[PDB]
Amino acid sequence: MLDDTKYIQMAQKFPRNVSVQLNKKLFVTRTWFRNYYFVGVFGIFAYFIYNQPKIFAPFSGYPTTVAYKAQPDFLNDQVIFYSQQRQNTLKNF
């Protein structure tokens, strides 16, 4: 057994009215260093994990697409379009 006598005493008897004021500026400085090392360092890894599948597996993110057919309108010099909904699928393996 470890002789934890002094630590046991510390745990049993601790002040219950002692507190220290914290310099807001230094607290903010440390926290914003933490944010700097999160957004700009771990953000790279997080964004890679989130996006790389969306780059190498794009077809699963855009399920439905549209296709068009066109006809002329000679007497008005216009073009008439008919649309169609399709399931976005692979093509020409």
Partner 1 sequence: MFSDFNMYEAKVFLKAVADAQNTFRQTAQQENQLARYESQSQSLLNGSTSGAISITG
Ligand X SMILES: CCCCCCCCCCCCCCCCCC(=O)OC[C@H](COP(=O)(O)OCCN)OC(=O)CCCCCCCCCCCCCCCCC
Q: Which residues pair with 79 in a beta bridge?
A: 72
Q: Give me the least distance between CB of 77 and partner 1, in Å please.
A: 13
User: CA-CA distance, 88 to 65, in Å (whole number)?
Assistant: 5
The contact mask relative to ligand X for 31-50 (x = CB under 6 A, - = no) is -xx-xx--x-----------
Q: ∠ CA 85-86-91 to the nearest 5 degrees? A: 150
Binds ligand X (CB under 6 A): choice among 8, 9, 27, 29: 29
| Four-point Cα dihedral 35, 40, 42, 44, nearest 10 | 150
User: CA-CA distance, 33 to 66, in Å (whole number)?
Assistant: 48
* Partner that binds at residue 29, options ligand X, partner 1, none, CB closer than 5 to 8 Å by kind: ligand X
Q: Give me the least distance between CB of 86 and partner 1, in Å please.
A: 18
Binds partner 1 (CB under 8 A): choice among 75, 82, 86, 90: 75
* Partner that binds at residue 71, options ligand X, partner 1, none, CB closer than 5 to 8 Å by kind: partner 1
Q: Give me the least distance between CB of 54 and ligand X, in Å please.
A: 16
For residue 24, how far is the Cα from the chain centroid? Answer: 30
